[PDB]
Amino acid sequence: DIGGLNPCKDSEVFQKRLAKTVKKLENRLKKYEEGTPPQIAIQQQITQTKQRFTRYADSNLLCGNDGLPHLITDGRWSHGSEFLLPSILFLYISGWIGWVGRKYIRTVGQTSNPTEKEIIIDVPLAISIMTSGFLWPFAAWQEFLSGDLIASDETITTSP
Amino acid sequence: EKSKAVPFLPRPAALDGSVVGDVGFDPVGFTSWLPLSYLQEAEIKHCRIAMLATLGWIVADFVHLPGAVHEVSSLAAHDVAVKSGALAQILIWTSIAEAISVIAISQMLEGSGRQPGDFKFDPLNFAKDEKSLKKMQLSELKNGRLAMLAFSGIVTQAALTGHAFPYM
Amino acid sequence: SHTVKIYDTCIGCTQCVRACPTDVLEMVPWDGCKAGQIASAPRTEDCVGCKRCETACPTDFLSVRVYLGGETTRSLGLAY
Amino acid sequence: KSTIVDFNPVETSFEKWAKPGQFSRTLAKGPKTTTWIWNLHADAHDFDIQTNSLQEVSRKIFSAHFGQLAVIFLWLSGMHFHGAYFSNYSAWLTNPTSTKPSAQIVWPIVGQEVLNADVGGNFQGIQITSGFFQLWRAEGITSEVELYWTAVGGLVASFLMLFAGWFHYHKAAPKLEWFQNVESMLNHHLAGLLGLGSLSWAGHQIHIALPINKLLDLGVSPEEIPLPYEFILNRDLIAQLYPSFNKGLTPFFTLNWGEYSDFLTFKGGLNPVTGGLWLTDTAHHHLAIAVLFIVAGHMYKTNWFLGHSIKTILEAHKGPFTGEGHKGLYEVLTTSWHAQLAINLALFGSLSIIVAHHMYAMPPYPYIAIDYPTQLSLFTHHVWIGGFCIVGGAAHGAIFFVRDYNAANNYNNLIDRVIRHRDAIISHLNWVCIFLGCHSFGLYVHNDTMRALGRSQDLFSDNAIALKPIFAQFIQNLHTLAPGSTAPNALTTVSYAFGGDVISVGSKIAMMPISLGTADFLVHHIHAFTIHVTVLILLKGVLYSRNSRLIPDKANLGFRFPCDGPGRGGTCQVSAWDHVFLGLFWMYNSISIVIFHFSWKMQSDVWGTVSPTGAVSHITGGNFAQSSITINGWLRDFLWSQAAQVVQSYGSSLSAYGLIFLGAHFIWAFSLMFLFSGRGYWQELIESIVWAHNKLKVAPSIQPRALSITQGRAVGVAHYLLGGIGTTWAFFLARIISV
Amino acid sequence: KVFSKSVPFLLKPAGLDGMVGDVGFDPLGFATFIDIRWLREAELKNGRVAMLAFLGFIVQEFIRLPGDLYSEPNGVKAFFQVGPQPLLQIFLFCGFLEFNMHKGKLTQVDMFEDGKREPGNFGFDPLGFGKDPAKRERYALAELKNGRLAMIAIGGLVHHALVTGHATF
Amino acid sequence: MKDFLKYLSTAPVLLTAWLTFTAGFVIEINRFYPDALTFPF
Numbered sequence A: 001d002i003g004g005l006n007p008c009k010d011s012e013v014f015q016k017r018l019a020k021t022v023k024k025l026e027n028r029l030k031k032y033e034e035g036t037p038p039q040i041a042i043q044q045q046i047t048q049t050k051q052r053f054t055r056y057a058d059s060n061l062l063c064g065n066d067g068l069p070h071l072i073t074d075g076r077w078s079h080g081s082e083f084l085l086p087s088i089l090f091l092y093i094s095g096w097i098g099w100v101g102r103k104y105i106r107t108v109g110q111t112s113n114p115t116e117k118e119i120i121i122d123v124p125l126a127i128s129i130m131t132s133g134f135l136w137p138f139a140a141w142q143e144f145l146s147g148d149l150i151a152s153d154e155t156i157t158t159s160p
Numbered sequence B: 001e002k003s004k005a006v007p008f009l010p011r012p013a014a015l016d017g018s019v020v021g022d023v024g025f026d027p028v029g030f031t032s033w034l035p036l037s038y039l040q041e042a043e044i045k046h047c048r049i050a051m052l053a054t055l056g057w058i059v060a061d062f063v064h065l066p067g068a069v070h071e072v073s074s075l076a077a078h079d080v081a082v083k084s085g086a087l088a089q090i091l092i093w094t095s096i097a098e099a100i101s102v103i104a105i106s107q108m109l110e111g112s113g114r115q116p117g118d119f120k121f122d123p124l125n126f127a128k129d130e131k132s133l134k135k136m137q138l139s140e141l142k143n144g145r146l147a148m149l150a151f152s153g154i155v156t157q158a159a160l161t162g163h164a165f166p167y168m
Numbered sequence C: 001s002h003t004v005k006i007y008d009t010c011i012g013c014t015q016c017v018r019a020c021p022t023d024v025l026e027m028v029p030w031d032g033c034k035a036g037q038i039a040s041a042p043r044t045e046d047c048v049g050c051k052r053c054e055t056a057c058p059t060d061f062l063s064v065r066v067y068l069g070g071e072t073t074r075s076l077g078l079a080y
Numbered sequence D: 001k002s003t004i005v006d007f008n009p010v011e012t013s014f015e016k017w018a019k020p021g022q023f024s025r026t027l028a029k030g031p032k033t034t035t036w037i038w039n040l041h042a043d044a045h046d047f048d049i050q051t052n053s054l055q056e057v058s059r060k061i062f063s064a065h066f067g068q069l070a071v072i073f074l075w076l077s078g079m080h081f082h083g084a085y086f087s088n089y090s091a092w093l094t095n096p097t098s099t100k101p102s103a104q105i106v107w108p109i110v111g112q113e114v115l116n117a118d119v120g121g122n123f124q125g126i127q128i129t130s131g132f133f134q135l136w137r138a139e140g141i142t143s144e145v146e147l148y149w150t151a152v153g154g155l156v157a158s159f160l161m162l163f164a165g166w167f168h169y170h171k172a173a174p175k176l177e178w179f180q181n182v183e184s185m186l187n188h189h190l191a192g193l194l195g196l197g198s199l200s201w202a203g204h205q206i207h208i209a210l211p212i213n214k215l216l217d218l219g220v221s222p223e224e225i226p227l228p229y230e231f232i233l234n235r236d237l238i239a240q241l242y243p244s245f246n247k248g249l250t251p252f253f254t255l256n257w258g259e260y261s262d263f264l265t266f267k268g269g270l271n272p273v274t275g276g277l278w279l280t281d282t283a284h285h286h287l288a289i290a291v292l293f294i295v296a297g298h299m300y301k302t303n304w305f306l307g308h309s310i311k312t313i314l315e316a317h318k319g320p321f322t323g324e325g326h327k328g329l330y331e332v333l334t335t336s337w338h339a340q341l342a343i344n345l346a347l348f349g350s351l352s353i354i355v356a357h358h359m360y361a362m363p364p365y366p367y368i369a370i371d372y373p374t375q376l377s378l379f380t381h382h383v384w385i386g387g388f389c390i391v392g393g394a395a396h397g398a399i400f401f402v403r404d405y406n407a408a409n410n411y412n413n414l415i416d417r418v419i420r421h422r423d424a425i426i427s428h429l430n431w432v433c434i435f436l437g438c439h440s441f442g443l444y445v446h447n448d449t450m451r452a453l454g455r456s457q458d459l460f461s462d463n464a465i466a467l468k469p470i471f472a473q474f475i476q477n478l479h480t481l482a483p484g485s486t487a488p489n490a491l492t493t494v495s496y497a498f499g500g501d502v503i504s505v506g507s508k509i510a511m512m513p514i515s516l517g518t519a520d521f522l523v524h525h526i527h528a529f530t531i532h533v534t535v536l537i538l539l540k541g542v543l544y545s546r547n548s549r550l551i552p553d554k555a556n557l558g559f560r561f562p563c564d565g566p567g568r569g570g571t572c573q574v575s576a577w578d579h580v581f582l583g584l585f586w587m588y589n590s591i592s593i594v595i596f597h598f599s600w601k602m603q604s605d606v607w608g609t610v611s612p613t614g615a616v617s618h619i620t621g622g623n624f625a626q627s628s629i630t631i632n633g634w635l636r637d638f639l640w641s642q643a644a645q646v647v648q649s650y651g652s653s654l655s656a657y658g659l660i661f662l663g664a665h666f667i668w669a670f671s672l673m674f675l676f677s678g679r680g681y682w683q684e685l686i687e688s689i690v691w692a693h694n695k696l697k698v699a700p701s702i703q704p705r706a707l708s709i710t711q712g713r714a715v716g717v718a719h720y721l722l723g724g725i726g727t728t729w730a731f732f733l734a735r736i737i738s739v
Numbered sequence E: 001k002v003f004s005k006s007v008p009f010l011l012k013p014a015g016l017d018g019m020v021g022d023v024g025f026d027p028l029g030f031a032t033f034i035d036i037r038w039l040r041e042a043e044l045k046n047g048r049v050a051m052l053a054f055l056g057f058i059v060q061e062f063i064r065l066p067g068d069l070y071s072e073p074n075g076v077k078a079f080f081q082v083g084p085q086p087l088l089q090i091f092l093f094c095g096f097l098e099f100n101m102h103k104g105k106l107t108q109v110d111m112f113e114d115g116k117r118e119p120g121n122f123g124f125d126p127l128g129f130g131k132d133p134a135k136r137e138r139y140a141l142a143e144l145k146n147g148r149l150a151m152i153a154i155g156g157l158v159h160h161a162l163v164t165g166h167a168t169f
Numbered sequence F: 001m002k003d004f005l006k007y008l009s010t011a012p013v014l015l016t017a018w019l020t021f022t023a024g025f026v027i028e029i030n031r032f033y034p035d036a037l038t039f040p041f
């Protein structure tokens, strides 16, 4: 399909990889005894390996000639769960972190001892700001509009 | 000088007379480097816990709650109750009570006025004036110490010899 | 020998002179500051370039500046 | 109002916990730049600059020692708890020669359960190379319940040491005169600590370890072995194995000590069953050590008209060549903690290296000689600790010279006379270092270039120009002839390394004569050269810590400073700290070469398997003799060849070793950013980053500053050491566990 | 010292004075390091949501809607059978409600920044219950107590469905 | 418990607690839903 890849559900090398891993795990399982915790752990390993391979097969995942899932990150929504949705999730979380950090910096920057409140965090104010970051996309595009997001010329510059 | 309990030892210098159950017994001077209120609270907590524990051990070796899980001796009941989750509920509610206790003991140590072990729990009265309260505090302390020693003996004997209620 | 220059931002706090290990700087009368004194560099032939002088300077970007130049047995700190 | 302690000196309060940097006069005002954060940790234990009183520094040091001992006890308790709960110690007891010791199981997350290896005995976990199983077996511990109780005792002891530290800083802190009783301290540490510890351990060995281990070697399973207390209450369970307890203590008090030859032997060699030292020999050794140390503890005058005064001993040791001699040394060592730390750390690291040597040379634990990973790990770890401690001793000698050295109090004594001719010492040490390096390494390079040019007869090899270590071979011959000639009451040599028979346990070689040829000559001279260069750097740091021809007032700049400036052609790294930095680098080099020599020589010419007919086949096959004489040989037949197991560990239970190999490479390369660069570039880059932050109104109030020059060097050296030591760690462990 | 009325062995907590549910219950002092107005707003919203969700349980197991999707008497299993499409619409509608009811200021630092906002007072009163101020305080206390009881009961019902799987009945 | 809570509010203790909590919920997500290469939806 895309880039010459093929779905992993029809990739023979993918099933060969699964079979080889299961065979190695079973051979390891053979050298232990009865329902002893080592055998239980190896059986859990086998079950998890089978579940992971089955989930990857039924996941709209494209496999190359090596039988490994390749990620299609050109931007198409068909393979949108590989990069685009995790990209949105990370952008949300990281914007949350950056927004709460910036808000805390600007909030304790207007107190008597701004530097003290950076090594000794005001946990009440920190908790107040941190749970308010869920609106960071909206807060950012409400502070940029008001001109409160960017400094203009009070920023320092070197000699040249 | 010359504490009441040990007549040849000096008075512990932190227990003069103004505590219930104060016979001047502190030979190793635990009160010389620890707060008196803290030790009193610990002692009263131990007294109550061990009284409940002794009564429960003795009763549960006689009467069992309905169910197959409750058909074990008190010596072996810990491993069964922890597996069934019975002790998990007690742990949860005891932890809630002990967090409230953290707050209470902190407030008592930093002023307040709460007497050690005084949770004001008194649905009935059983103590109307100062004299009755002092007498009942002494009774509680003595019964609690006796029950702590009794539970110690009960557990040690039952573990040594896996006998029923007579742990001889 | 190195080159040492003094600039009128001098506040005459004498910290440069009392930090020179080779007696290069000295305090001379002046009328451009409250202290009425300014640092001078009349013995730059003994300047070693250690720049202790400008480590003790409190003015914003320095009032004593050391420009390293040609080397000499005195400026190289050679006891041999 | 005791005469030794002060009562309630410091109040137990949490107020100062909420004021970081309260100890320092400069840091107490609060942070203004990020340099304050780094200065906070760099001055935490520098008690000299926190107080102006030696008494307060001594009390802080005493409580810090208690905290350290509590940490050590907690670590030991954790080790015993892991042995009790997450180990296959019981299975290893019944099959020491076929079960690999494991005492750490790995949770099944993110696929990391592959790390749980097939260590044997129906167990999965990480193979343990610390030798705790062998130590516990030598202690007579035959059950995991005993390990649990030892862990509980360790926890109790750790709490006790924590309480002791708190008590002796806040409730009863000793006075300066108590700390300065060096005669009493030496008497107690020599008699009580050392001698009585040896005596107590001899008692434990005789009454617990001797019978239990004898029963274990006889084939008695641990379950039917009597509990250790039964060997004390019943004089018949121990009198069957050693038929001399039937006489009781009467032979001891009647001076008929010959009766106790049953369990106090002098045999030498190794136990043929376990491959370790005879535990009867060990018990006799500890008894003799106890008596010797107890006797040695009655030397210094403490409180009676009896014993020696160290001041009078030192002051009487003058000479024509040494002026006032040792006059003033007693005042130096009783008023400066740094001098004591220097001596103790140097001798402590040297002792650690000696311990490392004597460990593999004479394996003291049952079934530890045939556990090659344990032997390799123990040697390498102890040599690394020794090198670090020696560098620390040099560092604190330099610190004493900078800070606590008084010129007036040391007029014409040994310290003064050493400083007065420091030039001669350093110049001759420089010449010796150049001579040794030229010779050792250039002989290596000559071998390499002769081999590369196809001239095999021009090498410094055994089949070529030969450099036989005749002096060491003479000593080896003297030791193998000692039993019956110079040690007439010995039955076997102290170690089979000096010569004798091949000792094998379960077809695995425990010890064997270590032949010394031209390959050992070159590597030994490499060791000497590296040690000499490290000594050169550290001694130059110590001697030139106060002044020099460059900076005549270097002592006024302190022990730790980056430079004096770009003048004098450049005065980088003139400190004494910058010498402990370079010396750390050279110690890494020396110890790395030492452990490489040990690993290759052991794998190639000691370790291996013995055929039933007596044919010895080694791990590598004797390639050390002919291929360790060229640098290409070291690169190919050792590094490239034995790195095969590390690089091929992916997908196996040793994959963690490959991951740590790669990560240690990454950290070592990361160090070079700090080692090669300078502060100005990073400060000017932080300037633009701060511009961006200010543009987005997110510039922190604590101004971000690049790490100071000294801190940049410290970060570089720490990362370099971590990366190199971790790379060697992963390489050694994967290689010696795979094969 | 005053000592709390609810927890009689603890000192009276601060910051609860002028409230409509004050029994002095704050052993952990959450009102000291968190704004009391925000705490009351959160308590009221959690209570109202829990009441609606408890009523939703009881109605769902009884009545249900026509259709194959809406055929699970168990609320927990109904959360999965209904699919993501109906749930995401509820999520977006609740978001729209949140935005319009608080008029933009939705966060802990933004809400109550200007004051003039009684905690939990959305002005929602179409049926007119609450014109008389005498019964207003009683209604507020009843709403608070019912909300707390419904939080406890919503947890109880959800966890009953998880440990048994059938229904509440 | 006024300065102890201030000590717990210091940068190292707060960072250690936050990173321990963060690693905790990450590890537990990866335990309950392991081997997640793509978005679950």
Ligand code: CLA
Residues within 6 Å of the ligand: B049, B052, B053, B055, B056, B057, B059, B060, B061, B063, B064, B065, B066, B069, B070, B071, B072, B073, B074, B077, B078, B081, B086, B087, B090, B093, B094, B097
């Ligand atoms: C230290 C207190 C304590 C502890 C840890 C236990 C623990 C146990 N008991 Mg037990 N018990 C206790 C006191 C205690 N008991 C007392 C005082 C009595 C006398 C009424 C009993 C009577 C009793 C019987 C008859 C049985 C047990 C059984 C058991 C086991 C499982 C079921 C269970 O939890 O009990 C259930 C407990 C009860 C039904 C009665 C408890 C009454 C409480 C203790 C008195 C009120 C105190 C109050 C609630 C404190 C509030 C706590 C606060 C934090 C909110 C378990 C090992 C069962 C078992 O398996 O036996 C082997 C069983 O059949 N116990």
Ligand code: CLA
Residues within 6 Å of the ligand: D061, D062, D065, D066, D069, D178, D179, D181, D182, D184, D185, D188, D189, D191, D192, D193
């Ligand atoms: C026979 C008596 C005796 C013994 C056994 C020790 C033993 C020790 N001393 Mg010590 N000391 C003694 C007499 C003694 N001292 C006297 C008389 C003085 C006064 C001059 C000092 C002054 C002194 C200082 C200033 C320091 C020590 C330190 C140490 C420890 C060295 C660390 C070590 O090797 O780890 C081995 C560890 C163990 C074997 C663990 C078990 C040891 C336990 C704690 C027994 C300790 C014995 C103790 C003195 C008994 C007092 C009990 C108390 C109730 C009175 C070690 C525990 C150093 C240290 O680490 O500080 C804590 C240290 O800085 N000592």
Ligand code: CLA
Residues within 6 Å of the ligand: D041, D042, D043, D044, D045, D046, D047, D345, D388, D389, D390, D391, D392, D393, D395, D399, D559, D560, D577, D580, D581, D584, D718, D722
């Ligand atoms: C008994 C051992 C001992 C003792 C008591 C001391 C005590 C002291 N040393 Mg010292 N030192 C030692 C051994 C010792 N050292 C050794 C072995 C070396 C050689 C490396 C040195 C080298 C040394 C130098 C070069 C300096 C000191 C300094 C000091 C003083 C201040 C220390 C301080 O505040 O650090 C606080 C503690 C830290 C900053 C910790 C830093 C963290 C380390 C560097 C990294 C450890 C990594 C660890 C192994 C884990 C890595 C694993 C990874 C995967 C994460 C203090 C008197 C300084 C001073 O001014 O003396 C007056 C100083 O300049 N020492």
Ligand code: CLA
Residues within 6 Å of the ligand: D429, D430, D431, D433, D434, D435, D436, D437, D438, D441, D442, D445, D533, D536, D537, D582, D583, D585, D586
């Ligand atoms: C492979 C890299 C390397 C090499 C070769 C050296 C070499 C040396 N270092 Mg070192 N050093 C290194 C890395 C290295 N270092 C690193 C990375 C650091 C950073 C921490 C240091 C830090 C350091 C310090 C701090 C000190 C040294 C010192 C020394 C010298 C010890 C005396 C000696 O053996 O001289 C003999 C020279 C050699 C062994 C080099 C090879 C010479 C060949 C084999 C023989 C001669 C060849 C011949 C002349 C060629 C002629 C032909 C040509 C003209 C074409 C020596 C020059 C010490 C010193 O100054 O000397 C006493 C010293 O104090 N080094």
Ligand SMILES: CC(/C=C/C=C(C)/C=C/[C@@]12O[C@]1(C)C[C@@H](O)CC2(C)C)=C\C=C\C=C(C)\C=C\C=C(C)\C=C\[C@@]12O[C@]1(C)C[C@@H](O)CC2(C)C
Residues within 6 Å of the ligand: B084, B085, B086, B088, B089, B092, E144, E145, E146, E148, E149, E152, E163
């Ligand atoms: C009921 C309750 C609290 C009730 C309080 C009520 C109603 C009163 C509230 C009010 O008066 C106040 C306070 C103040 C007023 O202003 C408001 C009102 C509302 C008037 C808590 C329950 C709390 C209930 C709890 C904590 C239950 C926990 C259950 C657990 C942990 C079960 C675990 C297991 O089931 C598993 C998981 C697996 C099994 O195999 C094993 C086990 C162990 C059995």
Ligand SMILES: CC(/C=C/C=C(C)/C=C/[C@@]12O[C@]1(C)C[C@@H](O)CC2(C)C)=C\C=C\C=C(C)\C=C\C=C(C)\C=C\[C@@]12O[C@]1(C)C[C@@H](O)CC2(C)C
Residues within 6 Å of the ligand: B096, E075, E076, E079, E151, E152, E154, E155, E156, E158
């Ligand atoms: C534990 C609890 C309450 C505990 C209360 C206690 C101890 C109260 C004790 C007291 O009152 C007493 C006794 C006496 C008072 O005088 C004093 C106090 C001390 C005050 C509530 C839990 C409350 C728990 C609640 C509300 C949980 C709700 C869970 C929901 C809605 C889950 C939905 C999902 O699970 C599904 C359905 C499908 C999943 O796949 C997806 C999701 C979405 C996760």
Ligand SMILES: CC1=C(C/C=C(\C)CCC[C@H](C)CCC[C@H](C)CCCC(C)C)C(=O)c2ccccc2C1=O
Residues within 6 Å of the ligand: D673, D674, D675, D677, D678, D679, D682, D705, D706, D707, D708, D709, D711, D712, D713
């Ligand atoms: C990069 C660099 C800096 C800048 C380095 C800085 C500012 C250090 C920043 C450290 C951050 C802020 C904290 C550490 C973050 C790590 C992720 C934590 C360590 C990892 C743990 C596992 C230990 C210098 O200041 C410097 C000075 C002198 C010579 C070389 C250099 C140099 O190379």
Ligand code: SF4
Residues within 6 Å of the ligand: D562, D563, D564, D565, D566, D570, D571, D572, D573, D678, D709
């Ligand atoms: S900065 Fe680097 S180079 Fe410039 S002086 Fe200090 S040390 Fe020498």
